[PDB]
Paper text:
Using a phylogenomics-based approach and complementary structural techniques, we identify a family of dimeric hemoproteins comprising a domain of unknown function DUF2470. The heme iron is axially coordinated by two zinc-bound histidine residues, forming a distinct two-fold symmetric zinc-histidine-iron-histidine-zinc site. Given the ubiquity of proteins containing homologous domains and connections to heme metabolism across eukaryotes and prokaryotes, we propose that DRI (Domain Related to Iron; formerly DUF2470) functions at the molecular level as a heme-dependent regulatory domain. We heterologously expressed and purified the recombinant protein encoded by the Synechocystis gene [name] (formerly known as [name]) and tested the heme-binding ability of this small, soluble protein (96 amino acids, 10 kDa).
By comparison, the structure of His79Ala-Arg90Ala with heme has a similar dimer fold and interface as WT [name]. A slight rotation of ~30° of the plane of the heme is observed owing to the loss of His79. Curiously, the absence of Arg90 permits the heme cofactor to rotate 180° such that the propionate groups interact with Arg12 at the N-termini. The slight planar rotation of heme with respect to the monomers observed in MD simulations can explain the relatively similar heme-binding ability of His79Ala-Arg90Ala to that of the WT protein. Hence, the function of His79 can be compensated for by the other His residues; loss of the His79 axial ligands allows His16 and His21 to interact with the heme iron, therefore highlighting the variability in heme binding when His79 is absent.
Numbering used by the authors:
A (entry chain F): 3 to 94
B (entry chain D): 3 to 96
C (entry chain E), E (entry chain H): 3 to 100
D (entry chain B): 3 to 99
F (entry chain A): 3 to 98
G (entry chain C): 3 to 97
H (entry chain G): 3 to 102
Amino acid sequence: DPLTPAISDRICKHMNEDHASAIALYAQVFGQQTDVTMAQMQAIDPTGMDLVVESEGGSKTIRIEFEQPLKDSEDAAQVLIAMAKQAASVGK
Amino acid sequence: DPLTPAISDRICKHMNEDHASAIALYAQVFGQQTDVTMAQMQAIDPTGMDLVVESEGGSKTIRIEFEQPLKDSEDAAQVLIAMAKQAASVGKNS
Amino acid sequence: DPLTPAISDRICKHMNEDHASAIALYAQVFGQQTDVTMAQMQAIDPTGMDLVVESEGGSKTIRIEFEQPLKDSEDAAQVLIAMAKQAASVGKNSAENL
Amino acid sequence: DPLTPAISDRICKHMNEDHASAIALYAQVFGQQTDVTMAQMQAIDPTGMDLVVESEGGSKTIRIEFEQPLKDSEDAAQVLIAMAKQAASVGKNSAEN
Amino acid sequence: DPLTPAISDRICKHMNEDHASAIALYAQVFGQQTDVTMAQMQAIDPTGMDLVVESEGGSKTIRIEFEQPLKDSEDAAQVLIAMAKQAASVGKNSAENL
Amino acid sequence: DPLTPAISDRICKHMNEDHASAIALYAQVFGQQTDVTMAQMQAIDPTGMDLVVESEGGSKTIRIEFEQPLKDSEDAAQVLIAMAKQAASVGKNSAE
Amino acid sequence: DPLTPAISDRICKHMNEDHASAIALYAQVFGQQTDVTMAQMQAIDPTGMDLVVESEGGSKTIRIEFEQPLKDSEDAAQVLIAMAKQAASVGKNSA
Amino acid sequence: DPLTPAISDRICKHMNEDHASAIALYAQVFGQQTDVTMAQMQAIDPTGMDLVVESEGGSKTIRIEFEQPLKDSEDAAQVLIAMAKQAASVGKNSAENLYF
Ligand code: HEB
Ligand code: HEB
Ligand code: HEB
Ligand code: HEB
């Protein structure tokens, strides 16, 4: 159940390097952003994640909270996977 | 996270729990297997991974090798995702 | 040239004599046959093509459908070339009985 | 499809869009040209084909002849596909300054 | 006779005096040289070869790194023989100008 | 050597000079003619051939069509040889 | 029609893909080879033809000559057709 | 380089392993042997070489002598290369049994 600054940043690097498309979906679907360009996961915490978005407003940073609290990095991956699939359906 | 049986255990249990569909795709496309009732992941290593496509009353021990060897845990996740994408594409054009 | 049953006969003839290896790949990767042996393109259609695969089971006549429909003879070659390349990548991550 | 000037137009069109990479291989291996920018198949004949590699000081108007003469459009492609495989092998064992 | 710098000098002598024509073929085929007046073999290394081409531009030292690495002096002769034969096939398709 | 009107003349002349007997068999078996004295090949098309026969009636211009269409001169020769062999077999197993 | 090395390749093809039994009959009744297992026509020239009976000891490269000279490809066909007839006659004989 | 038992074994080996065709040529042309099956270079000497041809009826040990004596291993290669081109030339002009 370890969610530290280091744990968060490796998780955010994997997402920013292997699943950058999903981060864009998070900002558009969950963060009601339209012109998503270079969406990045800045940090993730047991409660939510912080997304640096580059949209019409500019280079701002938003926060998306997870309904069920996260305990460990695995709970993060499962939630991120589920949110991306659910977000993929709304966008279509 | 470098090559170590313990790190491989967590990875094959994460895939066996979160991406069991991908394991099934591996057995059908790469393993040339037709009757996949329950495809499982027994082990992984830089050369290749070892899959077990069993059945209600059967078992298949198979080995799938990665073209380019894997060094750490994040490269294993990059190869697996890409392999699932390649297998997901084959299922479409058939 | 627009897709025609006569044009298909010409395409299948070229494939069986100049690119017979690809036909074998198509039936392993897209037809999921294990044994390879000889491989023949019996006919091609705007929706898909029919292959006669000699396999572990034996003489089988299977059909492989193209995701995007084919319009002319040129699209046939382009799809055939692309499908063979995709099979070449899968074949490179081959398997073996442990 | 017996060799005719009209057939050549079709073949050169197919090669310049679907197999332009092979045309590049032809010019370097068989044409002995090093600076390859845009390799094109202008025309093909039963004796040979004319490739164009536009470069500094004018387009490389060059002629590569097929050792054994071609009869139909199928015979042309058979020759081409084999010339490109010989070009893929040679290019692998390439040289450099 | 595993590859060594002394062994390379020996090999380059045999090729440079008994198979000097083949050296020209190497430079033309593999080194994409067109005019050849005197082709020479400076040195051979486990993975490659250094050639002096005295033609076309002029003084010109090129290197043909073999796609297959060598193990001994025998691999050099076998590789050199095979490369010359393969180069002979390209020579059969003459390249000219319009 | 794809079938062309110039190629047809070349094939028909060869057939009329080296295999005139076979042309007679075609008219009897495939053209169902009886008393053939001289048989000649006029033209060969991708789909069929024209035969000039002298039978029980007078000079007759008949047409014999090949079940499978012919593409080149080689298919013509192979088809002609097989058709002559089939006619040669009927004469062996035929009576009247 | 004019007998050229290119024409010979065309002629040998016809007699080797079709009427292949004719080539073997030739090197048996005109040629003096007894064990014929793969008779092949390598080349046709004006004076004769280079028959090759690939065998255990060696490809029996053997030459048969045409008493009457050949003029064009047509004379070749006429000469070949007639030679196969004397071969269906000498090959199948009584005792 | 200089004439030695091992020098002969490695030249005859290089020949039995890389140029077995040339050994076959040397026998047909120079040794007047015909219908050769397995031609081999048993030994090479400054004066000549000993070739072992295998024939349908009986094996053969023939000797082909070099007009000008060989001094070192390099002279051996240069002599064989020449004899092989000569035999190739004689190979192009092939005879056959005539019939009518
Ligand atoms: C977006 C969402 C998502 C998705 C969709 C995915 C999808 C995926 N994936 Fe993932 N992952 C993830 C998210 C994800 N993912 C995460 C978050 C993680 C974690 C990371 C870290 O921790 O850093 C992972 C992780 C991971 C891993 C590792 C594990 C260990 O290390 O133990 C692997 C192998 C994978 C695979 C995979 C695959 C094959 C796929 C396809 C099916 N993955
Ligand atoms: C498999 C796949 C494939 C491949 C790999 C190929 C490869 C090739 N290719 Fe190919 N193609 C093809 C498929 C193909 N292909 C097709 C399908 C076609 C069409 C045919 C018909 O139409 O018939 C062609 C066709 C063709 C042509 C045309 C001919 C005529 O016109 O008739 C040419 C020229 C060529 C070339 C070529 C080359 C050079 C190569 C190498 C790179 N192609
Ligand atoms: C180009 C390529 C090539 C070729 C073609 C050849 C071809 C030949 N070859 Fe040689 N080789 C060679 C490259 C060569 N080669 C080399 C590299 C060697 C080695 C050298 C040294 O080691 O130094 C030899 C080596 C050799 C030897 C040895 C020597 C000693 O031991 O010292 C001999 C004998 C010979 C012969 C010969 C012949 C007979 C022939 C046929 C013509 N070669
Ligand atoms: C009827 C059917 C038939 C038959 C049976 C035959 C049979 C025969 N055949 Fe014959 N062919 C023919 C039909 C035929 N065929 C044709 C169609 C041709 C083509 C012609 C033209 O193109 O003109 C020939 C062609 C021919 C040739 C070529 C010539 C030139 O180039 O000009 C020769 C060599 C011959 C041989 C022969 C022989 C040896 C025989 C056996 C006796 N053919």
